[PDB]
Every structure is written in C-alpha cells, then in structure tokens.
Design a protein around this ligand. Structure first.
Ligand SMILES: Nc1nc(-c2ccc3c(N)[nH]nc3c2)cc(N2CCO[C@H](C(=O)Nc3ccccc3)C2)n1
Length: 275
C-alpha cells in the first residue's frame, strides 16, 4: 500500500456537504490531479459528543463495500486535530436536487433509477448490511449519472433516521432490519413519481402519526405498476414487504411488473435515460 496521505497532499476547494459532526470538502490530490470528496471530522468534537461509534461504523462499512453504486472509501488519515476520509467524488450531487429540479420523474427514469437502487440494496443486504437511513439526500449521482449511495454512519452490520422515511418498526419497537431499507425504498419511489414523499405534515410528530397509521395516498397521475409496487413495500408488517427474506428476497422484487423491461445484470454499463 502507498504511504499515508496528508492534508498538504491536496488542494482543498468548495464544501460539498455538511453533516451533524463532519464536513465534506472537494479536494484535488496534487500528485495525481485526482478529485476526492474528503470528509473531515474534528476528533475533539467527536469524543466530546460521544460519536466515536458512528465514525468507526462508517469507516468499517464503507471499506467492506466494493460495488459501483456505492461511494467508496479510498483512504484515511489524520493530523493533530482532524480525521480525513477520502471518498468517491460524485460530481452531480444529490438525487434530491434532481427531484426538486425537474419536479417528478417520468416512468422511464423512475424505473431506471429505482432499479439501480434495488440492485444496490441487493448487494448491500447480501453482505448482511442495513443502511437504516436511506434517502434522496444520500443517494448521489456520479458524473455519468449513475447512483452512488453514501452516508453509512447509521448503518448496521448483522450478526432514528430522517422523519419522512422512518419505518413503522422504528416508531413502535426501536428495531430495524433489511426490511426497513425496503420501506425507505417505497417512500423514495413514491417521491420520484409524485414529486413529494408520501408522509408529509406540519411537523415530525404529525409525520410519525401518519406513518404508524399508513396514512397516505396516491395522486391520480401515478404509474399504476409503480403504485402496485409501492403498495407492496409500504406495508406496516415488515415481514410482508416485497424483497425481504420472509417474502423470498430479491427475486420476486426484481420480477415485479414495474421492472418488466429492465436488464438487471449490467445496469452500471447502461446509459441512464436523460432527466
Ligand atoms: N459519507 C458521507 N458522504 C457525504 C458526501 C456528500 C457529498 C459528496 C459528493 N459530492 N461526493 N461524495 C460525497 C459524499 C456526506 C455525508 N454526510 C453529510 C450529511 O450528514 C451525514 C451525517 O451526518 N450522517 C450521520 C449523522 C449522524 C450519525 C450517523 C451518520 C454525513 N456522509
């Protein structure tokens, strides 16, 4: 392996993202002219706020992963005050931005991007890893417009996330499983099509109320096969969500009529439909 990298090895530029206890900064490595998204954390702050387990979890998970649809951790280093994680730079930023930009996806784009997310989760879950906070904000887009999923501090490795995407089991048990990610997937599909998350309200409490009641509905202009699929994912009983182990996994999920024209084997090699 190459020698440990250091801050002076890079020219730092603009801020790419702000976390609860971290900041992601675009950086160019001088020797290679390569661009990385460097996540910077203050050791003192992480210790003071008892965040060490989240930092460690993200490092350990983002290292075990080797798949095109996930942001990769290339290297780490530190100076007296800070930790630096060198991550893949996804030039086109957050999926959330594109949803806001174009309003709502047509069926061809919904299907392609939904398929990449499903394919990514199949990989992740096959490694016994659960994301636990999947959302448009951490589904990034590469220069090529393929997804790259990031933000793994909340992940769990098998032996409360963002309000709008929280699964019922978190609200009623404080427990999460692979199926929690599938619930998130259902919300994300709904949002790609409707342009809005399914569970919306004045505040967090009211959102949680709707979730545990499964109180939401489809606009008239919702692709019917997408609706059927969403209905098989947004299910209160976590053991009855399409894709989960008790439902026999990813086979039946990928075989859903909404994905009829999808070629699953090489999505990363296909050219994404123009947004
Ligand atoms: N790994 C990671 N990558 C990015 C990122 C952003 C832009 C990028 C680009 N343009 N290319 N690559 C990029 C990578 C951002 C990010 N988050 C920022 C938002 O907050 C999160 C947080 O605090 N999560 C949390 C909070 C508390 C506990 C556990 C987890 C952390 N995490």
């Amino acid at each position: 392996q190459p020698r440990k990298k250091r801050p002076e090895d890079f020219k730092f530029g603009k801020i790419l993202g702000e976390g609860s206890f971290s900041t992601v900064v675009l950086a160019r490595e001088l020797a290679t002219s390569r661009e990385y998204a460097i996540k910077i954390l203050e050791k003192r702050h992480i210790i003071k706020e008892n965040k060490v387990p989240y930092v460690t979890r993200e490092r350990d998970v983002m290292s075990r992963l080797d798949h095109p649809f996930f942001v990769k951790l290339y290297f780490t280093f530190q100076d007296d005050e800070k930790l630096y994680f060198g991550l893949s730079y996804a030039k086109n930023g957050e999926l959330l931005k594109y949803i806001r930009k174009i309003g709502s996806f047509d069926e061809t784009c919904t299907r392609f991007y939904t398929a990449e997310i499903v394919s990514a989760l199949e990989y992740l879950h096959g490694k016994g890893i659960i994301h636990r906070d999947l959302k448009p904000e951490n589904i990034l887009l590469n220069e090529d417009m393929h997804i790259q999923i990031t933000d793994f501090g909340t992940a769990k490795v098998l032996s409360v996330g963002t309000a709008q995407y929280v699964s019922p089991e978190l609200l009623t048990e404080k427990s999460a499983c692979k199926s929690s990610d599938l619930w998130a997937l259902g919300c994300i599909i709904y949002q790609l099509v409707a342009g809005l998350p399914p569970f919306r309200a004045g505040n967090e409490y009211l959102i949680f109320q709707k979730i545990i009641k499964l109180e939401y509905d489809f606009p008239e202009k919702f692709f019917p096969k997408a609706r059927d699929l969403v209905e098989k994912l947004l299910v209160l009983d976590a053991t009855k969500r399409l894709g989960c182990e008790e439902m026999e996994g990813y086979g039946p999920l990928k075989a859903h009529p909404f994905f009829e024209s999808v070629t699953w084997e090489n999505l990363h090699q296909q050219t994404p439909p123009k947004l």
